[PDB]
RNA sequence: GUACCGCUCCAGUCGUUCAUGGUUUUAGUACUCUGGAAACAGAAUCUACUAAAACAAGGCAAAAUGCCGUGUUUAUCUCGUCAACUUGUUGGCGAGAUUUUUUU
DNA sequence: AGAGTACTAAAACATTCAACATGAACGACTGGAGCGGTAC
DNA sequence: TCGTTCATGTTGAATGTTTTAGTACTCT
């Protein structure tokens, strides 16, 4: 062990470490660890698929009920035709006349698949003909107005023809009504007498509520109802063993009232604050009697001036009004009976019950369970109170230990808790050696920063074990990046003084009011965009946004599928007339179109004048508003990831206090500080590094080691005294602060914060150590979901049949690739030649356009017609056509019966592989992600597929095992070291891998090359030396000589 | 400045609760072709729109208002460090075997 | 013996082509922001 | 922004073409 100081950096991709000597400021270690980058969309998807899982699992339950009761009353059997009966006619012809067994079964099954929305039971409004479900249910109701959904559906069938899509969202109770209609019609047609009418709708109205929870086995739920009504909330602060209590508990409201009474200001010739008798008269004459105690009605009990009482809290309206004894009146306004309202404890219990539930029937039972003096008559009324949810941060037994004396003295709350020697949550670990992971859970916001943080504990404990205890820790974060840059943007403004600074400050500092944290982005974008729409540059006044909302709409910039950003960076304010026509179109493509008000260049200069001054657009948002390359692909869908930013303050302080507690208990006078990225931005600015981004994973270290020296900067100059106090949060002596030096202006930064002799070891360091996370977890993303179909032809190969949908669009240019390249592929090239000629007419008459079909629509007002005798065919939007011969796939024709030709999924995902050495040739075996079996709490690599993956490679029994490789290992291949990405192709023995020192894309732009950045290598007899090297938690290099292929999978 | 209360609103997360849709196969009717003089017959087989009926390989539990599959090991292999699962393996601790050569 | 011809079988360097989707509602927690204030 | 000053960009599978060696004939 030697004396060392640590410097950490963290980002949603990686962790970066820099270890410097404490004595002579010499760096000893510098490197970066990588791990599987996490985004909220990941766990959100794991949600959404679980959601859909239950959706299907109950859709099948709704199948089960109808199935069994069809079997029951002699209605259905496994001998009759099930397909070919139209339910649209079924449910309407069931309005008056007979329905057959199988037809009735079809109608009932269809109305079981369909249930409609509950949370809009009683919507009555007009419609703007948008895509939302409320307005469409409004249309459905206004179109029925006497009829049932059956009639509208069947009419839209017989007349127009298309009968699904966005226009089948209907009010649920309408389905319920037509359910009664058809059930009672079929009542007197078969062996159905009384029971059959009920149980369906009873079951067809079943639903799980947003608080029933998932099933029993849930690793996220609860075994009992009342359990999570004791788990969701927090605990007491000063008594971290007993639960909190509700926001509107009666004695809690007494607490708040006494707070507002014991903080008052009186300018009379007596005691400054109220006496005990004065307060008691107040509580029994004003608060208990009137809902909102008016200041005009409070002075009459103490005989003081009506307008000399101050020092209290206000109500929601922003007017001075005291904390209402909300439950007291509300029970009084319906119950004057005195046996209960004179009991504080049962009233507290009533408040707690009213809060910790929201059901209108559970509160009834839980009030009957309070064995009070009430009757049914009152409880049926009291159970329907509203607005009494929310918990308050203390408990009963912290209120009691302060209530009694609060009667008497005139102090203010927390002081009493200090007199009784009550201390908030402070963890003790004075007996431990390394930093634990037990204290993590309380200090966590979301899984993203959870992953980004929890491994700093692992790395620092490893550094302690290998290095002893350090002397200082300095930490930079991924969420502390715009403190001081924004502060100087607020304060510096312009040097011209006077006219410039005294006018636009109302937009620079936003008038210096708290309104900035109440307007939200829907009004912030008005300030951000000069009060002008981005896509039109028309006026968007602040008074019109607050008095005419309907003129302008707030929406995102880029769809989630290629942006995944739900923050204040990916949203804009656009006039309703333009926003309604947007959808899947950004400013680049939207404003360059044939009916746009402006060009891309005028908008570009608009953004530039919005992004070249005070309050400029952030480069992350600037790239959103200019578009790069093309949005219609996946290449930008990944490049939009690594520029994004978020701001938070809880996540920093969580681990900050976690480190301080542990370092204070074990008697470790170790400085621990976190720096915002604002200061380090200036540091990187003024330290004169090379003008290049082709550095890769080393950035995270080269930046982090910056921080590792920044702390030492605090011990070289004497202008940092106030800066030292601020970065340590040190209290300023009242007669000292005005002369304490801090660094705020650029001249001070250049005189003080520039150390060229202490940065030659950070900029020029090129000896990093890398190590990647072996994501050995089983059960990950196996295989994609877009099923694919396959046909047979003359040669005898199987062919993927691709599909082309949405022919009507103006901007679908893909069709040129069929006729003008090779029309042989299309199926209608061989079959239906007459329709082929029909198509060929349009194809040839518009051979010099973008989309010949949209040209046809312009020139004839109607799209192409399905070819037939009379040429009056439905519009064409979809085309099947021939694709590729298929070798490496997943034969999945097992599930569909009767398939005249096989069906395949696509794009298997490799998990690991295995090198073997037969005499002088290395051969591969691949363990896919499909090669895992679940047993109890562990996962076994099914060796059958494994040994079938070595025989088919023709691997000798005498072949010499080298290593099994997991993801992102270090493979020694004949001239280099590489990271497993995966086995690109097993049959070809083509494998895809990547560089270690830098991103190989970024390596290509290091050479400015043009081939795809895929390190793909084919394995054959030409192999000479394949070995395993590996790296430790810091990233240092070694080799492993393990003897056997890993067979068992470690969990955890 | 931190912990501290109560009000108000806002955002996010977790976690839960939904409806509508999307992709591939039979009966189709608008289809393709054959035979046939055509009639007509069948068989195919491109576009559509409905009946039906399945969506990460699996594991379960077995009719129950059922769940998990994009959350952690940790650099691998030795050495022991003893104890509990008990064929093993676990659980930890530490040192090595591993990163410049002279070295007590 | 040594190489062009002509083909033939096979292996590297690169190209091209696919990815399941909307509208809602609510408990907690968390934090954010405005109101005042006591200890430490 | 006179300024490298919040800071990079997929995973799999199937083709097209390009590169070379081998073989046998035939030429010298
Ligand atoms: Mg940073
Ligand atoms: Mg929209
Ligand atoms: Mg960085």
Residue numbers in the entry: 2 to 1053
Tell me what the authors wrote about this structure, in their words.
Staphylococcus aureus Cas9 (SaCas9) is a widely used genome editing tool. The CRISPR-Cas9 system has been emerging as a simple and powerful genome editing technology and is widely applied to the fields of gene therapy, drug screening, disease model construction, etc.. This system mainly consists of two components: Cas9 endonuclease and single-guide RNA (sgRNA). Additionally, its DNA editing process is roughly as follows: firstly, Cas9 binds to sgRNA to form a ribonucleoprotein (RNP) complex; next, the RNP searches for the protospacer-adjacent motif (PAM) on DNA to locate the target site; meanwhile, ~20 nt guide sequence of the sgRNA tries to pair with the DNA sequences upstream of the PAM; once they are in a form of base pairing, Cas9 endonuclease is activated and then precisely cleaves the target site.
To promote the stable binding of the protein to DNA, we mutated D10 and N580 of the wild-type SaCas9 (wtSaCas9) into alanine and obtained dead SaCas9 (dSaCas9). In this study, we report the first cryo-electron microscopy (cryo-EM) map of the SaCas9-sgRNA-DNA ternary complex. This map reveals that the HNH nuclease domain is tightly bound to the cleavage site of the target DNA strand and closely interacts with the WED and REC domains. Hence, most parts of the SaCas9-sgRNA-DNA complex are distributed in the high-resolution regions of the map, except for the HNH domain, L1/L2 linkers, and a small part of RuvC3 (aa 717–755). The components of the complex model are SaCas9 (aa 2-1053; D10A/N580A), 104 nt sgRNA, 40 nt target DNA strand, and 28 nt non-target DNA strand. In addition, the model shows that the cryo-EM density contacts of the HNH domain with the REC and WED domains are attributed to the hydrogen bonding between the domains: S581 of the HNH domain with E131 of the REC domain, and S595 and R586 of the HNH domain with K811 and D812 of the WED domain, respectively. The model shows that the non-target DNA strand fragment of the PAM upstream stably inserts into the positively charged groove formed by the HNH, L2, RuvC, and PI domains. Significantly, the full-length model also showed the hairpin structure of the stem-loop 2 in the sgRNA and revealed that the stem-loop 2 binds tightly to the positively charged groove formed by the PI and RuvC II domains. In addition, we observed that the double helix in the downstream of PAM is also embedded in the positively charged groove of the PI domain, and the phosphate backbone of dA15 in the target DNA strand binds to K1023 with a hydrogen bond. Site-directed mutagenesis and molecular dynamics (MD) simulations confirmed that the interactions of the HNH domain with the WED and REC domains are important for the DNA cleavage.
